[PDB]
Amino acid sequence: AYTNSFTRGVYYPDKVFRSSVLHS
Amino acid sequence: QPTNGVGYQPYRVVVLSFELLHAPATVCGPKKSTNLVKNKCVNFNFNGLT
Numbered sequence: 001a002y003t004n005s006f007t008r009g010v011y012y013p014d015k016v017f018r019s020s021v022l023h024s
Numbered sequence: 025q026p027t028n029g030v031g032y033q034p035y036r037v038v039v040l041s042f043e044l045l046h047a048p049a050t051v052c053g054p055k056k057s058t059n060l061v062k063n064k065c066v067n068f069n070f071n072g073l074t
């Protein structure tokens with residue numbers, strides 16, 4: 001069987017604090 | 025064998041892989057910590073972050 005993942009499964013890519021920013 | 029030429033003699037090896045990260049430290053060099061100062065211009069070092 002299958003289902004849609006939507007926008008699940010994203011994680012913090014590194015141990016650096018950031019705020020009010022768009023990061024590639 | 026002890027008669028081997030130097031290229032065919034045994035060598036012991038250690039590779040130190042440093043886990044250098046933007047992360048909490050648990051291995052540090054033999055460096056003395058000071059007290060902390062606030063609301064004043066200072067030179068600083070936190071875990072080698074100068």
Ligand SMILES: *[C@@H]1O[C@H](CO)[C@@H](O)[C@H](O)[C@H]1NC(C)=O
Nearest residue numbers: 001002003004005006007008
């Ligand atoms: C992909 O998932 C949907 C439900 O999200 C499902 O209906 C579909 O059968 C799946 N695709 C294939 C090729 O089976």
